[PDB]
Amino acid sequence: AFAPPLPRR
Amino acid sequence: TFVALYDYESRTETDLSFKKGERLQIVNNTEGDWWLAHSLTTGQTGYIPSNYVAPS
Structure with a gap:
């Protein structure tokens, strides 16, 4: 349900 | 052409x-x-996450 936590730029 | 695997909410x-x-x-x-x-x-243009899309 919750997409993967956006990685760090 | 790529597809959004997840709803990217910039x-x-x-x-x-x-x-x-x-x-x-x-x-x-x-x-x-x-x-x-x-x-x-x-x-338009926008940096899409590489984890919210996939080749297809």
Whole structure:
């Protein structure tokens, strides 16, 4: 349900 | 042509937020975890996450 936590730029 | 595996909800005015089912034209993507795609509806640009999309 919750997409993967956006990685760090 | 790539597809949004997850609804990317950008928070800044730099990347465009896309939902699942929407397609995006991948521009440059061969290392960085953040690629830059270009929508085909209006024709805008936005860095799409490499984890919210997949080749298809």
